[PDB]
mmCIF file of C-alpha atoms in Angstrom:
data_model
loop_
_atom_site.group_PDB
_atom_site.id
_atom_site.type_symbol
_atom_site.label_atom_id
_atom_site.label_comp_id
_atom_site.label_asym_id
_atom_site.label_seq_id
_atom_site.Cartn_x
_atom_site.Cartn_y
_atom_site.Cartn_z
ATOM 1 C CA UNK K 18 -28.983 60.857 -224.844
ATOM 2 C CA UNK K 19 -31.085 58.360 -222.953
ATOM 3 C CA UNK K 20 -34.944 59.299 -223.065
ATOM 4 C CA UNK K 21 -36.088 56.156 -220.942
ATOM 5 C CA UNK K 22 -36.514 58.173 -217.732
ATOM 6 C CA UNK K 23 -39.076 60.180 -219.490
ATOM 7 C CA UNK K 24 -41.711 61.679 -220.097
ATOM 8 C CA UNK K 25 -41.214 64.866 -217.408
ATOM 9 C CA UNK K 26 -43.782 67.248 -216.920
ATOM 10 C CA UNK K 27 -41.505 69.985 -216.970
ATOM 11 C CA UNK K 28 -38.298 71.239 -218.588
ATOM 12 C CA UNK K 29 -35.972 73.873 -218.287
ATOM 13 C CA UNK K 30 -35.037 76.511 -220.754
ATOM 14 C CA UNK K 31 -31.093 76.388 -221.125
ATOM 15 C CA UNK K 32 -30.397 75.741 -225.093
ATOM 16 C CA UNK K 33 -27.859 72.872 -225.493
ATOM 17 C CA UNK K 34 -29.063 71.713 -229.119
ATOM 18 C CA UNK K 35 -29.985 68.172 -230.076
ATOM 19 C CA UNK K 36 -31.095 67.688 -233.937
ATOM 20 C CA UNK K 37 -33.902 65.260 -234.329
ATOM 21 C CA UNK K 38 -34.948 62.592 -236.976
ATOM 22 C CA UNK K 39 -37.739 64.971 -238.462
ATOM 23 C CA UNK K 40 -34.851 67.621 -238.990
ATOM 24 C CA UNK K 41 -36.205 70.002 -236.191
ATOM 25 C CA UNK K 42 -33.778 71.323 -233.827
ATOM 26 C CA UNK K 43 -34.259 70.479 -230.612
ATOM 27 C CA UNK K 44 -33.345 73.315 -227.988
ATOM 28 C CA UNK K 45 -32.446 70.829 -225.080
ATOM 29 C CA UNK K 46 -32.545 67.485 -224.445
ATOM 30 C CA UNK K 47 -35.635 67.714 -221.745
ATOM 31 C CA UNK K 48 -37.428 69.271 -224.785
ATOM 32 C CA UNK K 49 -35.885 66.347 -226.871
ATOM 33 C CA UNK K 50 -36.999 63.430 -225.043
ATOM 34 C CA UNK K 51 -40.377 64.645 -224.242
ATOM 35 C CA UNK K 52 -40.939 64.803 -228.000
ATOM 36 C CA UNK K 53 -39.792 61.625 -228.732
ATOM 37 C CA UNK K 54 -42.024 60.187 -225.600
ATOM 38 C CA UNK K 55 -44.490 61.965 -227.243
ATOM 39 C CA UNK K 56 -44.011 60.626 -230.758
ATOM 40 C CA UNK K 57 -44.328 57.074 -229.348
ATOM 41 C CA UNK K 58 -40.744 56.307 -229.642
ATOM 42 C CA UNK K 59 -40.347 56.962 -233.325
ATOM 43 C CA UNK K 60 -38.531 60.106 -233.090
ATOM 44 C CA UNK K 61 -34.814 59.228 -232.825
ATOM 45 C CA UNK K 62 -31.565 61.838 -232.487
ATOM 46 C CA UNK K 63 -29.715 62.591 -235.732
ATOM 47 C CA UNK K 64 -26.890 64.353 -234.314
ATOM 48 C CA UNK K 65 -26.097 66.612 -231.843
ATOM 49 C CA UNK K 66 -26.108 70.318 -231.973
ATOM 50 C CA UNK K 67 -28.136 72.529 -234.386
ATOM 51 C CA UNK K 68 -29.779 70.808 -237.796
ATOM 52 C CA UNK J 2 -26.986 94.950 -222.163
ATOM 53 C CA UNK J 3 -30.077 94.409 -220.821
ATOM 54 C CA UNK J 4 -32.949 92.086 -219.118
ATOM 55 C CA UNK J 5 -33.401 89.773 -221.755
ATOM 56 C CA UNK J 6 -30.450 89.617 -223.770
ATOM 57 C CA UNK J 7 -28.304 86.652 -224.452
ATOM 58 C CA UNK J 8 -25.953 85.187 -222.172
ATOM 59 C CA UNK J 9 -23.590 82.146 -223.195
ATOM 60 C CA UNK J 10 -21.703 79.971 -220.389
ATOM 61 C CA UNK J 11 -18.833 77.739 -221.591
ATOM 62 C CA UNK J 12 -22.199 74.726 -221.672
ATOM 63 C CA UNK J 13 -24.976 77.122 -223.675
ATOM 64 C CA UNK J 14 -27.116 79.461 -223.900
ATOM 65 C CA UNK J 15 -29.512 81.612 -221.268
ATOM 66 C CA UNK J 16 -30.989 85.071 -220.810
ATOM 67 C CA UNK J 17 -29.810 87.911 -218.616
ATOM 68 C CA UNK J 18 -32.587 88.263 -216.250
ATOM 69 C CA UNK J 19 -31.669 91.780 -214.797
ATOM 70 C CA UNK J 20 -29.037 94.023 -213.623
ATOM 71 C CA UNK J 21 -28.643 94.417 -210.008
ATOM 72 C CA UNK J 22 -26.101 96.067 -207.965
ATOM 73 C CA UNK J 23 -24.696 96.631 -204.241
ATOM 74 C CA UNK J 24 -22.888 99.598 -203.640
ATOM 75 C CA UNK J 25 -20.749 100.149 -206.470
ATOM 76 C CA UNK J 26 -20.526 96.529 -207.499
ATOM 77 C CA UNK J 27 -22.410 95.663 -210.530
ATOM 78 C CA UNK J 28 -24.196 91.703 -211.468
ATOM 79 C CA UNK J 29 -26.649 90.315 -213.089
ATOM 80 C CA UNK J 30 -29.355 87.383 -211.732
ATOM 81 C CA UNK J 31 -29.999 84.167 -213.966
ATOM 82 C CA UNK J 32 -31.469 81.513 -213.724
ATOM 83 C CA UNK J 33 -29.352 78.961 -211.060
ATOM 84 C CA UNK J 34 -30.120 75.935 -213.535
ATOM 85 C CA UNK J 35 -27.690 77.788 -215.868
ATOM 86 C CA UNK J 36 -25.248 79.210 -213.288
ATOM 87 C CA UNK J 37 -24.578 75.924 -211.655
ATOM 88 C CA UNK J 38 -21.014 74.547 -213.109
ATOM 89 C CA UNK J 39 -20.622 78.081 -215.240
ATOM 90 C CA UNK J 40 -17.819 80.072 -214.293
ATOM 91 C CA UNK J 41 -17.375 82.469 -217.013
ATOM 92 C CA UNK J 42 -19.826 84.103 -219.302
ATOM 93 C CA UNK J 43 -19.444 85.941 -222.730
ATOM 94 C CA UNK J 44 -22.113 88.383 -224.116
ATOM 95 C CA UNK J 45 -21.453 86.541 -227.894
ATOM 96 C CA UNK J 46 -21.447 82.810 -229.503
ATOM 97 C CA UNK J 47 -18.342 83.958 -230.443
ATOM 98 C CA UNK J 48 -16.525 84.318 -226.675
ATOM 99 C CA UNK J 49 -15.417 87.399 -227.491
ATOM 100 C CA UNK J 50 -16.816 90.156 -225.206
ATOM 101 C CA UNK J 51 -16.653 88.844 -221.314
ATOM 102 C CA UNK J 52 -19.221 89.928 -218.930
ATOM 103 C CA UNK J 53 -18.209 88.688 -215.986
ATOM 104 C CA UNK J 54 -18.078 85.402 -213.471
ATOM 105 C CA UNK J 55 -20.447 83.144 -211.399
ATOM 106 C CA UNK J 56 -21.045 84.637 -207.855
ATOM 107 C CA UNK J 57 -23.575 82.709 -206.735
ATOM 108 C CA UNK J 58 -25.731 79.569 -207.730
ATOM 109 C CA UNK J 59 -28.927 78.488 -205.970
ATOM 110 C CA UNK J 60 -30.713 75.559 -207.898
ATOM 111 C CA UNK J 61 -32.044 73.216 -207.167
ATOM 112 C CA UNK J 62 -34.706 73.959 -204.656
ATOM 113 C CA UNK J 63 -34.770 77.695 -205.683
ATOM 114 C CA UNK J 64 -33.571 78.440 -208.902
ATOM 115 C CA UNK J 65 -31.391 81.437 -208.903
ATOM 116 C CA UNK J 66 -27.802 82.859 -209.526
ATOM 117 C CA UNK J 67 -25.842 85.893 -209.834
ATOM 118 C CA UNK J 68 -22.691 86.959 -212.458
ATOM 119 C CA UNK J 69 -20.697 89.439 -211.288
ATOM 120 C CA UNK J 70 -19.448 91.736 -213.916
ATOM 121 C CA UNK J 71 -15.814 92.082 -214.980
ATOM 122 C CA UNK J 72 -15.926 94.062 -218.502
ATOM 123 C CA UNK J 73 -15.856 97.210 -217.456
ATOM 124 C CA UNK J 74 -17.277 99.083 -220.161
ATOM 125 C CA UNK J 75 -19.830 97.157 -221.777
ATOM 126 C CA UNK J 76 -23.498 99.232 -220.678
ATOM 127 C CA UNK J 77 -25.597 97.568 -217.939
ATOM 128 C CA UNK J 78 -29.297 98.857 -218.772
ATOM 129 C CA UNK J 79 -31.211 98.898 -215.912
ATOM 130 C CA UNK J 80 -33.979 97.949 -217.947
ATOM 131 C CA UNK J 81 -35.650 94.773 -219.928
ATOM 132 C CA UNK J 82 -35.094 95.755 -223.483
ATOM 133 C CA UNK J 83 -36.213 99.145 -223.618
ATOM 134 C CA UNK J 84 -38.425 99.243 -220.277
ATOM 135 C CA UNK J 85 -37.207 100.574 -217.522
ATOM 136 C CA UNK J 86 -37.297 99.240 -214.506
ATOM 137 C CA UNK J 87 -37.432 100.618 -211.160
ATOM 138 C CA UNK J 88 -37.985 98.320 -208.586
ATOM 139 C CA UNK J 89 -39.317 95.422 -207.653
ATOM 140 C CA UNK J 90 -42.243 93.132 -206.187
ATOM 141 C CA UNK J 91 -44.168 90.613 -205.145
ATOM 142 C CA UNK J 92 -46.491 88.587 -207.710
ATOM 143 C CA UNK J 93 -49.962 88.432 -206.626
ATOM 144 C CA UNK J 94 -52.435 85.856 -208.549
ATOM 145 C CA UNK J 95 -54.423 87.217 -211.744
ATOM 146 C CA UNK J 96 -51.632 89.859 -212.070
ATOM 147 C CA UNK J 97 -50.773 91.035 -215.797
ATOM 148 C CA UNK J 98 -46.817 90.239 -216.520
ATOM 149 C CA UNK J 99 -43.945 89.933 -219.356
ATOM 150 C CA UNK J 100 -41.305 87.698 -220.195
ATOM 151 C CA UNK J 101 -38.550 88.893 -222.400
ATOM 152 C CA UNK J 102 -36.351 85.938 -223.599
ATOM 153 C CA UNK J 103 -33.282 85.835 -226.204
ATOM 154 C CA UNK J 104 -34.767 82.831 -228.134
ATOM 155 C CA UNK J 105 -38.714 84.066 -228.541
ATOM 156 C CA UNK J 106 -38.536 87.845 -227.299
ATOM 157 C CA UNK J 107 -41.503 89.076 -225.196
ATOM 158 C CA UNK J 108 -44.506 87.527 -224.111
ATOM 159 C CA UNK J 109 -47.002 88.246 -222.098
ATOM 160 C CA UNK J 110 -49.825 86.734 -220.005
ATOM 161 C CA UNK J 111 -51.080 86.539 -216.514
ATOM 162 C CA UNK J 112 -49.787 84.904 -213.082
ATOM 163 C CA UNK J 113 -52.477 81.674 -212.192
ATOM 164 C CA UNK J 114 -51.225 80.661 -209.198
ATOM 165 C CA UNK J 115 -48.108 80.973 -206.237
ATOM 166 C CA UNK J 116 -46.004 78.955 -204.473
ATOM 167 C CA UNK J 117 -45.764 75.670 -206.720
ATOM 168 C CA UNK J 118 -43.669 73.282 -206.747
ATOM 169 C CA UNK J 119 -41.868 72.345 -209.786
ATOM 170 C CA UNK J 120 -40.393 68.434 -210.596
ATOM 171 C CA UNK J 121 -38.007 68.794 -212.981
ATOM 172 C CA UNK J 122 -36.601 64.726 -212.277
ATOM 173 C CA UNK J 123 -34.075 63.473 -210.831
ATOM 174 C CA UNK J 124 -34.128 65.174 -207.851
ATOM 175 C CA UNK J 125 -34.124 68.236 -209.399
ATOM 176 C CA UNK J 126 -37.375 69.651 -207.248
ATOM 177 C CA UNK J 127 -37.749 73.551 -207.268
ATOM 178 C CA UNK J 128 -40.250 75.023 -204.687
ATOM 179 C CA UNK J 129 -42.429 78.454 -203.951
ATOM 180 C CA UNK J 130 -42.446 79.278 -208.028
ATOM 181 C CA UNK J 131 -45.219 81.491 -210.168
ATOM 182 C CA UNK J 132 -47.003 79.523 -212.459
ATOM 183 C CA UNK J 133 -47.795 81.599 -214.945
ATOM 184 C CA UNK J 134 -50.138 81.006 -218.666
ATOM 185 C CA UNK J 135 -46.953 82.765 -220.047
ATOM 186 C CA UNK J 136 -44.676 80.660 -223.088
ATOM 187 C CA UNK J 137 -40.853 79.704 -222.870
ATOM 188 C CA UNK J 138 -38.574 78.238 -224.607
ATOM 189 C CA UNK J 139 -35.429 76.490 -225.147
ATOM 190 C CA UNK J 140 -32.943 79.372 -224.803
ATOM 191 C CA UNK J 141 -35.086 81.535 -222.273
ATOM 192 C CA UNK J 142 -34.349 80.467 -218.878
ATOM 193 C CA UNK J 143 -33.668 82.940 -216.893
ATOM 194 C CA UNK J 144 -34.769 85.867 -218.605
ATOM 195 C CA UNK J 145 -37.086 88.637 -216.727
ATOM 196 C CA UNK J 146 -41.149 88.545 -215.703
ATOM 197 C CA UNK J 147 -41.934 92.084 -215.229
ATOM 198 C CA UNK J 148 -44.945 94.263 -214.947
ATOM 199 C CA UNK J 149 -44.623 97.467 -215.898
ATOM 200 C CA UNK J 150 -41.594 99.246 -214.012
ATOM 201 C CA UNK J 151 -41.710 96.225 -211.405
ATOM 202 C CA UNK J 152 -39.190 93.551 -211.575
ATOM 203 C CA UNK J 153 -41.160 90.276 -210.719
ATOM 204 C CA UNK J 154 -39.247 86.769 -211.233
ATOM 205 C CA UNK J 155 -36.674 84.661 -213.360
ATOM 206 C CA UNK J 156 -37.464 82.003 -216.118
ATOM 207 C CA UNK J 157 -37.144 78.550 -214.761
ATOM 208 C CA UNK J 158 -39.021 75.957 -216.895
ATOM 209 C CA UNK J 159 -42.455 74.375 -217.922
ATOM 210 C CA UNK J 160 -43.651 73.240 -220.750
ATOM 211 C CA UNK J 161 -45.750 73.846 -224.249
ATOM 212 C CA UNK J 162 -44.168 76.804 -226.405
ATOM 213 C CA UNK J 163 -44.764 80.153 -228.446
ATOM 214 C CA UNK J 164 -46.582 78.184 -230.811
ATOM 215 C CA UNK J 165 -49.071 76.629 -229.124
ATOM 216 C CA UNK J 166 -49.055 78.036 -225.692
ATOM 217 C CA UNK J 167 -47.516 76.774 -222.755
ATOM 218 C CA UNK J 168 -47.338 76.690 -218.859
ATOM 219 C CA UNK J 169 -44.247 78.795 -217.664
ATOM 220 C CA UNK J 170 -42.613 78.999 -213.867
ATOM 221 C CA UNK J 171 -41.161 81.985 -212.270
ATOM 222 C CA UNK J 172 -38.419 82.273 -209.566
ATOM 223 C CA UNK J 173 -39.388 85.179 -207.183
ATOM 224 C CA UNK J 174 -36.627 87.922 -207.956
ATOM 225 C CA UNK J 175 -37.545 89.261 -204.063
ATOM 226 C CA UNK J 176 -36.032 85.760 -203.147
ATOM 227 C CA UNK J 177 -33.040 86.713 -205.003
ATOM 228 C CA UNK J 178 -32.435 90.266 -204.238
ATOM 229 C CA UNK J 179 -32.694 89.271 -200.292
ATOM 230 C CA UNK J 180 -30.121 86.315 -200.585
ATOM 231 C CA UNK J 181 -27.502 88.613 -202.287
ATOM 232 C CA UNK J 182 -28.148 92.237 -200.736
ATOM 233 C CA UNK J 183 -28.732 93.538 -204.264
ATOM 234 C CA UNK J 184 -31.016 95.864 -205.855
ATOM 235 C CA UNK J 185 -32.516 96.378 -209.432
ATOM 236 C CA UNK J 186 -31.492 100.171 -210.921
#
């Protein structure tokens, strides 16, 4: 997952997902990326699928 | 099964928006952003109980689809949860509506403004939705906007969530009902 063509003001709501550094599960990776966009880039993906 | 409910593809998860039908052929409209590249869909994680296949698929641009049913004896509500609905309609700005989703349930709220166009990157551009001051999230998409008995569009996106409010947008389920000769029951 590639976050550098974001941040996108809007995002679908399919769930595909994506754990996250902070342990919070991600429901898809427009969601995802936003956050880490948001967190200044220190938010980084742990692994994919549920936490 | 009903508006609402969970739908998995072989990719992840959506919502059943509603349950439509022509004749005596029974489907069910989605969002298209979850019907594009699905073919089959089960009613559990599990794969276990079928529902049917991918009929149509309209996203971007609009963002709409329709599942025709193939398990022949699983119920098809013709409501959203327990509501019944019985027909449907146009949305109309300051009107009072509900989303029911299978990842946050129902939520209500009111329609702000028609005919927006949505960016979601890449080219993916959907046009003529209802912004709404209604939350979504990650599991919603294509799940019903209702008011009262009257069907009135399909989860497509935005952004925010449950928690702290967010900005959700609504495919017109009149667009959808026209482009496949269906009706809601």
């Amino acid at each position: 997952v590639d976050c550098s063509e974001y941040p996108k003001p809007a995002c679908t709501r399919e769930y595909r997902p994506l754990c996250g550094s902070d342990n919070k599960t991600y429901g898809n990776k427009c969601n995802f990326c936003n956050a880490v966009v948001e967190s200044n880039g220190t938010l980084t993906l742990s692994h994919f699928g549920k936490c | 099964i009903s508006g609402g409910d969970a739908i998995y593809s072989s990719t992840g998860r959506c919502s059943l928006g509603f349950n439509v039908r022509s004749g005596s052929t029974y489907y069910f409209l989605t969002a298209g952003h979850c019907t594009d590249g699905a073919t089959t869909w089960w009613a559990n994680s599990a794969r276990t109980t079928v529902l049917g296949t991918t009929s149509g698929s309209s996203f971007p641009n609009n963002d709409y689809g329709i599942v025709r049913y193939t398990n022949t004896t699983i119920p098809k509500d013709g409501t959203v949860g327990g509501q019944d609905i019985t027909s449907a309609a146009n949305a109309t700005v300051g009107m009072a509506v509900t989303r029911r989703g299978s990842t946050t349930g129902t939520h209500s709220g009111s329609v702000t403004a028609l005919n927006a166009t949505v960016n979601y990157g890449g080219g993916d551009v959907v046009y003529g939705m209802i912004r709404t001051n209604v939350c979504a999230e990650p599991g919603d998409s294509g799940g019903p906007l209702y008011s009262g008995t009257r069907a009135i569009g399909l989860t497509s996106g935005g952004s925010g969530n449950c928690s702290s409010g967010g900005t959700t947008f609504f495919q017109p389920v009149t667009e959808a009902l026209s482009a496949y000769g269906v009706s809601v029951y």
